[PDB]
Write a structure and sequence with these properties.
The structure is cut from a larger assembly and holds three copies of chain A (477 residues). Chain A is an alpha+beta fold and 477 residues long. Chain A has three domains: 323 residues, no CATH class; 122 residues, no CATH class; 32 residues, no CATH class. Chain A has twelve helices and 21 strands. In chain A, the strands form four sheets. In chain A, strands 4, 5, 6, 7, 8, 9, 10, 13, 14 and 15 form a ten-stranded antiparallel sheet that branches. A five-stranded mixed sheet of chain A has the order 17-18-19-21-20, with helices on both faces. In chain A, strands 1-2-3-16 form a four-stranded mixed sheet. In chain A, helix 1 packs across helix 3, helix 4 crosses helix 8 and helix 6 packs across helix 7. The first copy, chain A, is globular, with a radius of gyration of 23 Å. The structure holds the ligand Cc1cc2c3c(c1C)C(C)(C)CC=[N+]3c1c([nH]c(=O)[nH]c1=O)N2C[C@H](O)[C@H](O)[C@H](O)COP(=O)(O)O (3 copies), manganese (II) ion (3 copies) and sodium ion (3 copies). The site of one manganese (II) ion (MN) has 5 residues of chain C, from strand 7. Chains A, B, C: GO terms for molecular function: carboxy-lyase activity; metal ion binding. Chains A, B, C: One of its GO terms (cellular component) is cytoplasm. Chains A, B, C: InterPro entries: UbiD (IPR002830), UbiD-like_C (IPR049381), UbiD-like_N (IPR049383), UbiD_Rift_dom (IPR048304). Chains A, B, C: This is UbiD family decarboxylase.
Chain lengths: 477, 477, 477
């Protein structure tokens, strides 16, 4: 529950020390910002606040890696700064069950109205938008962002997150996969020979984009869902030109209309997919930007895609993957679950149970492998006992390294993949052949003889936590 | 919604002709009744009403195979006599979602009070109980039955179905698997050095035992659930001796108490498990029978176990298996489901989808294989396209025979089984080794080339149904 | 040993009651007859005798499903109406060994001469020929039929069964696979610039077509073989126009000549292959029909292809498949064979042995899998112990469901298939790639521990037969 981006940054330095966010002066938008973000992300550095970008006025800032740590996700979710990775999951999972839609609160004034820019004054190049990676088609101002549209017939307002590239001083490309709600709406104003009116937020309260990104059902306005996660409706404004609701204290908004493909498209160069590879460039859907709103010292909220095994700068904890699988395991009557986690979004799913029967391990693997398809590359599935910290790749590895008989525990299944999968050959795709496969890896102590298992040389968790909280100041631990 | 067994039999002959139930005179309780039931069941004969059993008074009857057909399950569920097998599933599945507990209705009079028998008059041998199979430990009067107990502290009343063998003129053995609600309750009166008071119904309205058998949650009195499936609470009576609620128009009730194992057990010979094999004999939990209630011409409702690939005389349609898997496939986001069915309870699960993507088939297989473990022998899983009648073993076979590449479509998975599995070796069990396996068989037309699939030489379903309903009288069809 | 079709129908109602054959009035040749045949066949109804077909004179009849039951095959083979399925096999197998060629008996008069039709009077459309399935290329009067030709040089007369479609009022298409004896002969009269003279029988004594269908060696006139199975030579007539021998009391004969492909072909639409799929339409070999002979109230003997897992209306017992495999198992020194059966012609072969050694089961599987290739789709092979009724799909299933360890007993072999196989992809065929595979499934009680196998809950066979023959009238059983 944040007022705006700045309340969030503050909150971070309140709960974590002034070191938790660090301001960087004189990095360049071209490659340099992105490359810093990527390395800092790998090293779980501070959240980065980029200032005095050469060619740009002071306070014209970029904020990256803003939720690229466990402890950060906890603050953002407003739990104790020191809440465990798996506790966050437990929390998220259970929030899921007790949240009702709380609508946005109208509100009359707000920081978004400090600088409004119309007709000629509309220059997208005014922002210090980075070119995040060599090979991007342009500069992607719209990453951790909101794309807002209103259904004209009902009045549902849908906020989702589509990549937005700067295509000129008044054009912003968006890429929406076929099935996107924004597009569903959009087509109402097309089959009526108007444009589809749209606003697009490119910096603001991260809880809001956390929500924009949530795969909310149709008809359901993800503004409400945000209200749900914070507990009070979000402070909002009729955008002047289009009427659409935008955040009162947002950082930067573009308003205006998006016509049909057949009338104006632009070339939307590649950008990185979630699997850590560049997707395809095409002629994409573009928006004519008619208004720019921005606060003084406007910050862009930047989440450029990284390879998925790097901490994800916009939520390092895999909230959705971990939690939704966990609900499926329960529904699938798997028992004594101690934890569910995902590395690289969903490419290794990990499950920690307490085995009470011979079939538990294989039952959890098949359960996890059969859950609701999402992003359509699946690969590894790993079950382990209740003494493995599955949020700690090292610990999971040691289990894969020391509790797996490869002749018995590795189950390679031959199954199809999806076009998105970087490992499908041109020859295969073209022939409609989607064969890939998955691995079910049973890394559990064998049940028949579990009590006879060699004992781990490692401190128990309680003690680990006694020493941690005792040697708090002194030493990272 | 039946008044009693006799309303049900009537209903059967009303909806199906007087041929649907047939009365059999002069078969013997020893083997002969059972053996007739088994063959008639295989041939989907009439529901059998056994009369003039030698050594027994007229009207002392046995009723078997009472729901051993699709069309019978439909009448019992009170849908059109001619409702399709899969329509029944669709119905059951959806009833599941709209039923609330409707409690039993007290009622003052009823047919159960025509003959009450106390102290010396209590002779279990009075009933023409069959010895259903050679190898049964005795005569099993308690098959399609209700075992009623009341929790003394709360007052929850639990009705479940445990095998009941006649162990003398006043003793009835029951076998309850460790985790049975009756036993949960029972242990309250043991840890208090009283017996556990119990009544046991051995003939009555089959909807009632349909419900007794439903794996209802703890705390939940499956009398209510019966109320749910019929739409009105069930007509019921405080049994005189124990207070427990029993059906007003029931056929035969035994009331009395069951002490702890350590005080009186009996040898409870084998009887057939659901997998079509004899389980183990042991010293079992026994009930001292103190009252016998029975109507004039009392009928025993008999469901002896058959091998599971025979039509199950007590519900030939696999209501629970088919429906609960279907809910899991939905939850697991499998789509365009046309049908789910099970042969031999759950040993082949079959799923009919309409493929819209390369991964559908394997996704449905894994989804089904990971669902909530129940009876703990799993074996085959089969997915097919939307033109297969999966309720017709012949049609499913032809798909397994003509749409499976064995080198690509048969996925043998190595997984553990449970002690109940007749194929686990003594050597394995003793060593705690439960290895068995399952098969995922993709019997779908290959998606990459589906439109090029050879065309089936078989009448479309609409036409099949035009000719069927047109040539109705004339010819079985 | 039947006089003609009518002696056969009679024989059926003599041995089985008047219910065994049922006369159907006012079904239409277009689809309706076929669709009734198919459903009645699935339900093992009566043999169907179709009368008063709209547009057609009375007694112009169609007879289907004429041998679509075990008990029917027994009557046809003239054994006790109640001979077991496997007894029929045992009988067939052993007949095979004691039959010598008994030639046809000349005879002077016969029912075939009641109506002869020449030049203009030749109208094939006169018969109430059904269009058996939607998708057939025309109406297939020639299904359960005889195609008779005489070798001009030697005088061998060959009768085989090729599909015959009505192609006009005086043209009948035949499709002969490359290697067919009729064609072998035919080519003698082509390489001599005459037509090949031919007669084609389309209703008659079913023993005769049983024989026409028998894959008799070259040089061997399958008229003789018929003599062998009945014990007396068959009553026969020089057809007037061509001289060829035809049955004295046949129902319907067409006589005339068939020229070479290059001189007159017709389009021979698809019809159903034995694997339950439509084959390819092509330009086919046609016969110019010059004579029509028919008895008063002439019946067409109709065996339309059904999917192979339906009871085959023309012999539900798989005489040839079951018996010839059985001889191979013997020759392959497999021992204590109790039974061999086939479902869907040959797509699951089943073998029942009495195991006396560790290697028996796998030895029977490989033996069966290596036998003489016939129709060129093979798929499943199943061995079981001597207590399985392998003629009862339910019983075989329960064995596959409860006696197979999938991790040990399922042997998938990678082997090529043939073009006929509906599951081979266009891409594969075109590349000359015939990979498919087969499964060897050992469903035997494991020998090492067989005596410890859980005991079947099912009535022994003797008793099953005591109750069956005791409760004969009373109840189907
Ligand atoms: C978090 C997030 C989600 C992206 C996304 C990105 C991020 C960071 C980017 C900016 C890094 C790369 C682009 N993204 C796209 C995307 N969906 C889409 O169709 N096109 C995209 O370009 N999504 C998915 C989208 O955010 C969620 O699936 C929404 O719930 C879908 O919105 P909707 O349900 O209202 O249609
Ligand atoms: C339909 C049915 C279910 C049997 C059953 C049978 C049938 C026909 C028989 C009579 C053929 C063989 C015996 N049965 C037993 C049984 N559960 C058990 O612990 N012991 C048994 O002997 N069950 C299971 C029981 O009916 C259901 O699982 C109940 O929902 C469990 O009751 P509860 O939930 O109240 O404890
Ligand atoms: C029983 C039977 C066998 C058919 C047959 C059918 C049936 C019902 C039909 C009518 C349903 C479909 C068509 N059939 C053809 C066929 N052989 C062939 O080359 N073309 C066919 O069209 N055969 C095979 C033929 O009957 C036997 O293989 C003969 O033994 C071969 O005759 P021959 O040995 O004298 O050449
Ligand atoms: Mn949405
Ligand atoms: Mn219960
Ligand atoms: Mn021949
Ligand atoms: Na969204
Ligand atoms: Na119950
Ligand atoms: Na032949």
């Amino acid at each position: 529950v944040f007022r705006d981006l700045r309340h969030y940054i503050d909150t971070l330095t309140e709960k974590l020390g002034a070191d938790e966010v660090q301001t960087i002066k004189g990095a360049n938008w071209d490659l340099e910002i992105g490359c810093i973000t990527e390395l800092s992300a790998e090293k779980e550095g501070p959240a980065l606040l980029f200032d005095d970008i050469p060619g740009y006025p002071s306070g014209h800032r970029v904020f990256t890696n803003f939720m690229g740590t466990v402890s950060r996700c906890a603050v953002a979710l407003g739990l104790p700064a020191d809440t465990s990775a798996m506790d966050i999951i437990r929390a998220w999972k259970d929030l899921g069950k007790r949240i009702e839609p709380i609508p946005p609160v109208e509100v009359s004034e707000g920081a978004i109205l400090e600088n409004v820019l119309e007709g000629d004054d509309v220059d997208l190049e005014m922002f210090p938008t980075p070119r995040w990676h060599d090979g991007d088609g342009g500069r992607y101002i719209g990453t951790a962002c909101m794309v807002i549209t209103r259904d004209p017939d009902t009045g549902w307002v849908n906020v989702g997150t589509y990549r937005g590239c700067v295509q000129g001083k008044d054009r912003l490309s968006l890429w929406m996969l076929g099935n996107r709600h924004a597009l569903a709406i959009a087509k109402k104003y097309w089959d009526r020979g108007t444009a589809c009116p749209i606003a697009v937020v490119v910096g603001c309260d991260p809880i809001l984009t956390t929500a924009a990104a949530i795969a909310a059902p149709s008809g359901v306005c993800e503004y409400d869902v945000a209200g749900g996660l914070r507990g009070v409706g979000v402070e909002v404004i009729s955008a002047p030109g289009t009427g659409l609701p935008i955040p009162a204290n947002a950082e930067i908004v573009f308003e205006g209309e998006m016509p049909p493909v057949e009338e104006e498209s632009v070339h939307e160069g590649p950008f990185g997919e979630w699997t850590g590879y560049f997707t395809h460039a095409g002629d994409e859907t573009v928006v004519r930007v008619q208004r720019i709103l921005h606060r003084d010292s406007p910050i862009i909220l930047g989440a450029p895609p990284m390879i998925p095994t790097v901490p994800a700068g916009d939520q390092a904890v895999p909230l959705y993957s971990a939690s939704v699988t966990w609900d499926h395991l329960e529904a699938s009557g798997v028992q004594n679950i101690k934890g569910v986690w995902a590395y690289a979004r969903q490419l290794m799913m990990v499950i920690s149970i307490e085995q009470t029967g011979a079939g538990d391990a294989m039952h959890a693997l098949l359960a996890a492998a059969g859950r609701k398809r999402t992003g359509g590359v699946d690969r590894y599935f790993v079950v382990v006992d209740e003494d493995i910290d599955i949020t700690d790749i090292n610990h999971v590895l040691w289990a894969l390294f020391t509790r797996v008989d490869p002749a018995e525990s590795i189950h390679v299944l031959r199954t199809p993949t999806t076009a998105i999968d970087p490992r499908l050959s041109p020859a295969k795709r073209e022939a409609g052949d989607m064969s890939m496969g998955i691995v079910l890896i049973d890394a559990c102590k064998p049940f028949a003889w579990k009590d006879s298992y060699p004992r781990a040389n490692r401190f128990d968790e309680p003690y680990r936590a006694e020493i941690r909280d005792r040697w708090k100041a002194t030493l990272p631990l």
